[PDB]
């Protein structure tokens, strides 16, 4: 799938052909639109001193 074809918001559903289920299932896999872009904030949490005592 082209990169430009995914950002346009198209319905890409896959189908299966199995003998147990006569009716194929459809799974809607589409990227939701209208969302915003937020800069992620990375924080590092050092381990507490209560764990280093156990060694």
Partner 1 sequence: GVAEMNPNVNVFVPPRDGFSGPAPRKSKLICEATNFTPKPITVSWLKDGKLVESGFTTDPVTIETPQTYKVISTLTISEIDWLNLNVYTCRVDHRGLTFLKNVSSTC
How far out from the chain centre does Cα 37 lie? 16
Strand partners, 29: 12
Strands (E), 1-55: 12-14, 27-29
Positions touching partner 1 (CB under 8 A) are 15, 17-19, 22-24
CB of 32 vs partner 1, minimal distance in Å: 29
How far apart are CB 29 and partner 1 at their closest, in Å?
Answer: 20
Smallest gap from Cβ 8 to partner 1, in A, equals: 28
Q: Facing residues of 28 across strands?
A: 13
Q: Is 17 or 51 the residue whose CB approaches partner 1 more closely?
A: 17
């Amino acid at each position: 799938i082209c990169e430009d074809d995914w950002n346009s918001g198209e319905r890409f559903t896959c189908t299966v052909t199995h003998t147990d289920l006569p009716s194929p299932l459809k799974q809607t896999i589409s990227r939701p639109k209208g969302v915003a872009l937020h800069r992620p904030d990375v924080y590092l949490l050092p381990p507490a001193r209560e764990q280093l005592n156990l060694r």
